[PDB]
Design a protein around this ligand. Structure first.
Ligand SMILES: CC(=O)O[C@@]12CO[C@@H]1C[C@H](O)[C@@]1(C)C(=O)[C@H](O)C3=C(C)[C@@H](OC(=O)[C@H](O)[C@@H](NC(=O)c4ccccc4)c4ccccc4)C[C@@](O)([C@@H](OC(=O)c4ccccc4)[C@H]21)C3(C)C
Ligand SMILES: CC(=O)O[C@@]12CO[C@@H]1C[C@H](O)[C@@]1(C)C(=O)[C@H](O)C3=C(C)[C@@H](OC(=O)[C@H](O)[C@@H](NC(=O)c4ccccc4)c4ccccc4)C[C@@](O)([C@@H](OC(=O)c4ccccc4)[C@H]21)C3(C)C
Ligand SMILES: *[C@@H]1O[C@H](CO)[C@@H](O[C@@H]2O[C@H](CO)[C@@H](O)[C@H](O)[C@H]2NC(C)=O)[C@H](O)[C@H]1NC(C)=O
Ligand SMILES: *[C@@H]1O[C@H](CO)[C@@H](O[C@@H]2O[C@H](CO)[C@@H](O)[C@H](O)[C@H]2NC(C)=O)[C@H](O)[C@H]1NC(C)=O
Ligand SMILES: *[C@@H]1O[C@H](CO)[C@@H](O[C@@H]2O[C@H](CO)[C@@H](O)[C@H](O)[C@H]2NC(C)=O)[C@H](O)[C@H]1NC(C)=O
Ligand SMILES: *[C@@H]1O[C@H](CO)[C@@H](O[C@@H]2O[C@H](CO)[C@@H](O)[C@H](O)[C@H]2NC(C)=O)[C@H](O)[C@H]1NC(C)=O
Ligand SMILES: *[C@@H]1O[C@H](CO)[C@@H](O[C@@H]2O[C@H](CO)[C@@H](O)[C@H](O)[C@H]2NC(C)=O)[C@H](O)[C@H]1NC(C)=O
Ligand SMILES: CC(=O)N[C@H]1[C@H](O[C@@H]2[C@H](O)[C@@H](O)O[C@H](CO)[C@H]2O)O[C@H](CO)[C@@H](O)[C@@H]1O
Ligand SMILES: CC(=O)N[C@@H]1[C@@H](O)[C@H](O)[C@@H](CO)O[C@H]1O
Ligand SMILES: CC(=O)N[C@@H]1[C@@H](O)[C@H](O)[C@@H](CO)O[C@H]1O
Ligand SMILES: CC(=O)N[C@@H]1[C@@H](O)[C@H](O)[C@@H](CO)O[C@H]1O
Ligand SMILES: *[C@@H]1O[C@H](CO)[C@@H](O)[C@H](O)[C@H]1NC(C)=O
Ligand SMILES: *[C@@H]1O[C@H](CO)[C@@H](O)[C@H](O)[C@H]1NC(C)=O
Ligand SMILES: *[C@@H]1O[C@H](CO)[C@@H](O)[C@H](O)[C@H]1NC(C)=O
Ligand SMILES: O=C[C@H](O)[C@@H](O)[C@H](O)CO
Ligand SMILES: O=C[C@H](O)[C@@H](O)[C@H](O)CO
Lengths: 757, 756
């Protein structure tokens, strides 16, 4: 190609491990090479073939980004989306470390996690956006770094996903050939057509952080880029990833991401998954085929040895040889695809439940409050919505990927979304249970209508008879979405529209709580004065109720803020966010460039209902004394691995990630109660066609009492004030005035100053 | 798009600006239009008086070798000739001498020097000889010192010609005479120049002229991106008056103004020659400007700023407290001006000696197989009309040295043709000086100075004379002039046939060339009968006496070439001279910064003689290259400052600060004493950069055999900078800079690396 494959060298932290992988790979025969480099049958989502002669075992690759999927004896962690709404780096890390402990203890070698910027968030309808974090390169980047580090700090290799520009589910069109029908014969995958500036500034940003953390592996995506399959795109894999980001680890296909044998082998793919698993229905392009291609001379053997060095580097780095993971005991594929019995192991540790609850309490985001919260001691409480209670069939009734219950089933509290990113629950702590516990301590009465208000005989009349005398009425709403489809619009799931219409008819103190994978349409009720409060709780995992109720009653003040923009209409967002076509070669031209989510809204002067980084507290905060400390710089010492990203200011002993200055401000608690506050920093980088403002810092001040002040600090790296030059092929700091802005949301920025290089 | 910045006097003109501003505040509108446009008089241009306020007419006078068209002066060597000395002391002394003569003849404003237009995009440019080096850095230095020399005498300078004025062909000055108008035939050549080329190449020497304190700048005849230079708002209001912070006046060239209002809004200050020369060269201001101001289409405050700029120089040079004496010569000529001339002799003791010293220091030895220096030859032959006088007299060719007949034997080429020539009180011919020396040695000497192709018996004379000569000198010339480019490199007159004859009948031919530029000597340069070749450029009045001491070894040659001598015209920058009859003729400067040696170095072309080449009667060894990063210093001594933006500007900083110095050692490693010009080149890193760029020179005088001397090259911030088109400032790029020191642009035995 224009774009050859560089040999791994282990880079910074993996040098000893690389040396060991190389010795090992040097001893391997050609058939052994093809064994490790492709999937085999087993209990985990994927499993690499052993090298039995050299004592290298099968590796278990296991979903997913909330913790091991399809296993018992584990915990159901909150989604990436939930942890992002915390804006709390300490929780991002702790979440990942805790997940990591469960992956390791269940016997997993390679976790298929985290989601580090694919999907990032170009459409708010993406059915899997929830697995990610923030709709913003900088914040996604930070969360990715910590998610990768928490996982690797436990025993577990990571597979950061999905590289790259994987921004819609519709027409993702994975390769499958089952019962005589092949995707190849119907429609090729969505092609993301992305300019060079958009790729560096937007989509590669989080991956760069994931490498720096360093992820052991990267999963390539289902989409094509510029009409070439991501999994065999030489520019993407060989040049952008293995050269500019200097990635020393392995590229793993997504399951059905590999569409051909030879292009994938020359153009950057290291591991073909799932290979013989899943009946070979997702393609099985390597294995014996790859042996035959090497021996008949059409694929370089040395190219394939490199693939193996990259897979083994992880094994040796994480010490899986000298401290092997225990046996993986659960059948996670499911019968009749795999007929194999499951054992049982319990890996739930003390502390985990309390961590999941803490993330919940730290993320719930308060969007409207007219004075009804915090609750005092209300004596008569009504509760509406099947979201307040259990799945009528059991918390795990929807099966191994939380997606198999009937279209009209009452799924109960939405604690995670559908797909390969879900996990099972040992229990669900329901909002109704936790409210009732509180009602009981206050000698109060509480009643819930949890039926489908449209279809259950008597439900509407039960609601009308219950609500008028309630002191407060909680309505729980939800909006399930899942991998493999995008949401068609912002409509609430189930009967939620109906429930809202009945609620505001019969009560003047409606508190609304939404469990959701993404933005929903609340335009019909949001300005109704009967709705005194609105909170979004995202996807809380198993501790749904006990994390929400302390916030409602004021034991702690809400402190979560939105990790994406909540527009009034789907029409306000980036146009053509989801392309639907029956064309053989479907096309998505990313013509918006870097302008996604809030940058789109700010550029077009569109006012969202709730902006990026919005969230209320039970107190108020005053910002003061913006300082730009030009003397507070520091060499980037601490990364696990280094990129080779070029940049104008390079010399011998220099980095794109050096801190070039630090900025400070002060916040004062100006209300009547203690609260935490998420401070945000935005920079306006000069140049043509630049976003109005780009997030470049956040800092969460915890439990700031009434009248007290605290200083927030924002280290600014060289990259943070840089632009990608498409003409030179490098990062540079533009000349001009940069506006530095600090405050409580993307549109609530009382403090501003100018910085010039 | 580009508003006109008001003058403020800047650095050294503050007190003069204040006086200027005051006088102009009192002027009526008619007085404003009087001072800002040309009137009739004895000098090349004359501003109108403002007689109520006691401001006299100012005399603007040609040209860059001294006051043109006067008697009683000396003929100085041309720009080209002083450039070949590579000697800053002589660059300054020459200017200071010209200045003294300018002042003493009555000139307020000298139409001098030439400071980077023409710079040298074509080696055929008919007026390239008026300038100095085909190189921005060296032209820069020469420009600075020439301005300084002229201003230190009583004279205001008009540095010229701004800008990108790189061919005479289709220069197409404005003229309307006997009913035919240039405007109806052809617009001027349009120099289309990209932004980096303009900053890195063409503006360089003008920036130096600004810093030196030039009082004014003359806009050129060409257009730039299809807009006339004298009404180019990007050129005059932005590039010159903003980025270069120029506080003085912009004077039109004579016929350079094509309109009334665009010129007044876009940065012109002085319309010349106005009523002069029969108003034939347009007369767009004057009473027309008065009318434009009165009816409100031209702002009066705008015009007051023109007038301020003109008067600042008057007051700065103290021309009110010490006025020049009256100008007494008719330099325009009858019938255009019928006015009698008086007489003044301004030639001072020491000027003839200075003119001789520049010739001796500039003559450049290109080849020597062992015939030079002469010892005491007994039988000397001399060929060529270049060896003696113009058969009609040194000044027969008139006020611009350009009116003799195409076939006239003009004798020794001491200056070129045009507005930058000057009259001579005498010519010391090469033949007279050779004879004087022959007579000391008791020798015989005979000269064949007729036209060897056209005069009965010349060929047979040459054939009978040369076989018995111990040495044959052949004197060659190539005349060129303003208003035309040379069609090719061929020698003037009978020169080719002279050379064919000389090498047929003699095996010791020493060739001396007097020339405005590169010539074609391919047919003879490698003939072993030609034992030496020297180029003496345009030596002014002391042609013979400057040359003969060098030939006989009283002093070794020390001159080196100020431009590249390629083997063929095809080896230079393509499209150097565009020839078309198109109404809007175009010259696309696609070569960018790559002119003269930069072109040759980038295309892998070997010249016959490289830029900065010249032999000595001895040899030099270079050693011990030192880059002293500790030897830095603040820019303190400029007369005026620019406002050129640069990335490293803080409060109290300059683009002209010395950031480091380089040193090297030279050893005279031959058998005779000699002077050496050491040169420094720097390879600035980046995209499409020249291989090498001159960034210094230092001439060591008369180094004795076996002796060593240290050569010193201060390096300014601008000297290692690149212009960023994206950011619109100068920056020092990152990467490795190669620093090379040596005797020519292709003989660089020392090199080292500097990274910042
Ligand atoms: C297509 C697909 O994604 O399959 C995989 C198996 O590896 C893929 C990765 C994926 O993350 C995984 C494990 C999941 O976890 C998904 O959540 C997941 C899916 C999205 C789902 O896939 C779909 O709904 C497909 O659109 C659907 N596709 C089609 O029917 C189809 C067939 C031919 C041409 C074009 C399309 C399908 C349904 C059932 C079996 C295979 C394919 C299958 C699948 O059973 C799950 O699929 C299987 O368990 C399975 C696949 C093939 C053979 C036997 C079992 C699914 C679940 C768990 C429901
Ligand atoms: C055209 C031109 O450059 O004229 C000037 C006068 O100011 C100009 C500046 C220039 O430096 C100056 C003084 C010179 O010194 C030049 O060396 C110089 C010239 C270049 C020369 O001009 C030319 O040869 C022109 O190409 C020539 N041009 C044309 O004939 C012509 C006519 C109509 C349309 C287009 C072109 C010309 C000859 C004679 C008189 C006017 C113009 C005129 C001129 O006589 C000299 O011109 C005059 O003395 C003069 C001009 C106009 C009317 C009367 C006298 C010349 C000399 C001294 C010979
Ligand atoms: C290629 O991979 C397969 C599957 O991992 C290896 O076969 C397994 O070998 C292990 C020992 O490491 C046995 O306990 C399993 O029974 C085998 N599984 C099956 C399905 O046969 C196989 O040995 C590997 N081949 C090579 C050449 O190393
Ligand atoms: C309950 O969960 C089930 C899945 O476990 C949801 O049913 C899927 O809904 C999507 C819409 O997002 C459809 O595209 C699928 O066809 C449904 N799956 C099946 C197997 O039918 C269901 O919508 C959820 N219930 C509610 C009220 O939202
Ligand atoms: C405009 O300028 C002209 C020409 O310089 C001035 O006329 C001359 O005035 C001087 C004194 O400054 C006299 O000695 C000359 O006799 C005049 N010459 C001619 C040709 O008339 C004129 O005075 C100026 N106009 C103004 C308003 O100052
Ligand atoms: C002549 O035209 C060129 C070509 O447009 C001009 O160069 C541009 O200058 C501006 C600054 O004024 C830059 O932002 C552009 O990038 C330049 N383009 C190139 C290709 O160099 C130049 O300024 C014009 N010169 C004049 C005197 O008008
Ligand atoms: C002697 O000088 C005269 C000028 O005074 C030269 O004649 C001019 O030559 C150019 C070509 O270089 C012609 O375009 C002009 O038309 C000529 N001028 C006149 C007035 O006829 C002449 O060429 C010189 N003699 C030699 C031998 O070079
Ligand atoms: C620093 C430099 O040399 N830049 C280029 C310049 O072209 C400019 C520049 O890229 C920028 O401001 O955008 C304008 C408008 O598109 C563009 O013209 O000039 C030369 C042309 O001689 C480019 O090739 C340079 O690379
Ligand atoms: C899997 C397989 O059989 N690959 C073969 C390869 O061995 C050879 C080539 C023809 O030389 O044809 C390929 O299909
Ligand atoms: C020389 C002259 O008078 N120029 C006139 C100006 O006075 C007025 C204008 C019309 O208002 O027309 C211009 O041509
Ligand atoms: C200042 C100037 O002369 N010209 C432009 C200007 O439009 C732009 O704002 C600036 C950025 O600093 O750079 C140049 O591209
Ligand atoms: C608010 O609720 C009351 C019943 O409590 C009802 O009478 C009224 O119509 C409701 N208002 C709106 C705007 O829905
Ligand atoms: C100069 O005198 C001549 C007569 O020899 C005449 O033709 C011409 O017009 C006069 N010139 C001027 C400018 O008056
Ligand atoms: C050199 O000169 C001699 C006369 O001395 C002549 O015979 C010979 O042909 C000439 N050689 C060349 C190469 O012109
Ligand atoms: O894209 C889906 C998931 O991210 C991936 O982990 C595999 O498909 C295995 O289920
Ligand atoms: O361009 C020619 C000369 O440089 C200039 O000084 C004037 O034209 C006056 O003769």
């Amino acid at each position: 190609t224009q774009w050859p494959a560089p040999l791994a060298n282990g880079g910074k932290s993996w040098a000893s491990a690389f040396k060991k992988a190389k010795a090992t790979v040097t001893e391997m025969t050609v058939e052994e090479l093809a064994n490790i480099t492709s999937g085999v049958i087993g209990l985990c989502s994927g499993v690499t073939g052993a090298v039995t002669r050299l004592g290298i075992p099968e590796f278990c690759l296991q979903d997913g980004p909330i913790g091991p999927r399809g296993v018992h004896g584990s915990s159901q962690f909150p989604a990436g989306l939930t942890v992002a709404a915390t804006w709390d780096r300490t929780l991002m890390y702790a979440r990942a470390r805790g997940m990591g402990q469960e992956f390791h203890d269940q016997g997993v070698h390679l976790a298929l996690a985290p989601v580090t910027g694919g999907p990032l968030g170009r459409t708010p309808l993406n059915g899997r956006g929830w697995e990610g974090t923030f709709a913003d390169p900088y914040a996604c980047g930070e969360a990715s770094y910590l998610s990768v580090k928490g996982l690797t700090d436990a025993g577990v290799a990571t597979v950061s996903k999905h590289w790259i520009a994987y921004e819609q589910e519709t027409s993702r069109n994975l390769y499958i050939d089952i019962d005589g029908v092949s995707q190849a014969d119907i429609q090729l995958p969505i092609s993301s057509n992305v300019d060079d500036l958009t790729m560096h500034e937007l989509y590669m940003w989080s991956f760069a952080e994931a490498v720096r953390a360093g992820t052991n592996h990267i999963m390539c995506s289902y989409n094509r880029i510029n009409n070439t399959h991501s999994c065999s795109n030489a520019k993407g894999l060989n040049q952008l990833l293995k050269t500019e980001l200097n990635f020393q680890g392995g590229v793993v296909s997504d399951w059905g991401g590999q569409w051909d044998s030879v292009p994938a082998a020359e153009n950057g793919l290291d591991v073909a998954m799932p290979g013989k698993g899943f009946l070979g229905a997702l393609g099985d392009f390597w294995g014996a085929t790859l042996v035959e291609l090497i021996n008949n001379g059409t694929v370089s053997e040395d190219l394939v040895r490199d693939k193996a060095v990259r897979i083994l580097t992880g094994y040796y780095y994480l010490g899986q040889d000298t401290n092997p993971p225990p046996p993986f005991v659960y059948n996670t594929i499911g019968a009749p695809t795999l007929n194999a019995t499951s054992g049982y192991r319990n890996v739930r540790k003390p502390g985990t439940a309390e961590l999941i609850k803490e993330i919940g309490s730290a993320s719930v985001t308060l969007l409207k409050n007219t004075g009804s919260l915090p609750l005092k001691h209300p004596q008569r409480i009504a509760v509406l919505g099947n979201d307040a209670t259990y799945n009528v069939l059991g918390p795990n009734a929807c099966g191994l990927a939380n997606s198999a219950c009937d279209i009209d089933n009452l799924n109960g509290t939405l604690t995670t979304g559908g797909g390969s990113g879900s996990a099972l629950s040992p229990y669900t702590i329901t909002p109704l249970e936790a409210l009732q516990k509180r009602a009981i301590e206050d000698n109060a009465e509480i009643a819930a209508v949890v039926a489908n208000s449209n279809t259950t005989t008597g439900a509407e009349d039960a609601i009308a008879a219950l609500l008028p005398d309630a002191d407060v009425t909680f309505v729980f709403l939800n909006r399930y979405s899942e991998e493999g489809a995008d949401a068609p619009d912002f409509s609430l799931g189930g009967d939620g529209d109906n429930l809202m219409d009945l609620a505001v008819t019969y009560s003047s103190n409606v508190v609304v709580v939404i469990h959701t994978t993404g933005v929903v349409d609340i335009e019909k009720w949001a300005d109704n004065p009967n709705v005194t409060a609105i909170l979004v709780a995202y996807l809380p995992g198993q501790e749904a109720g006990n994390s929400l109720v302390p916030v409602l009653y004021g034991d702690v003040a809400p402190s979560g803020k939105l990790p994406w923009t909540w527009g009034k209409s789907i029409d306000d967002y980036v146009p053509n966010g989801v392309v639907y076509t029956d064309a053989y070669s479907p096309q998505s031209n990313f013509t918006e460039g870097v302008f996604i989510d809030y940058r789109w809204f700010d550029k077009m002067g569109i006012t969202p209902r709730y902006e990026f980084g919005f969230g209320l507290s039970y107190t108020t905060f005053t910002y003061s004394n913006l300082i730009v400390d030009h003397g507070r710089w520091a060499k980037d010492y601490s990364s696990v691995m280094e990129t080779a990203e070029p940049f104008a200011e390079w010399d011998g002993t220099n980095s794109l990630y050096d801190v070039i200055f630090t900025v400070f401000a002060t916040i004062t608690n100006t209300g009547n109660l203690t609260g935490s506050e998420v401070a945000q920093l935005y920079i306006s980088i000069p140049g043509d066609n630049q976003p109005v403002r780009q997030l470049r810092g956040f800092d969460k001040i915890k439990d700031l009492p009434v009248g007290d002040s605290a200083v927030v600090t924002f280290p600014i790296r060289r990259k943070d004030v840089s632009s990608w030059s498409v003409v030179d092929q490098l990062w540079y700091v533009p000349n001009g005035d940069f506006l530095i802005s600090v405050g409580g949301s993307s549109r609530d920025l009382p403090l501003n100053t100018t910085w010039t290089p």
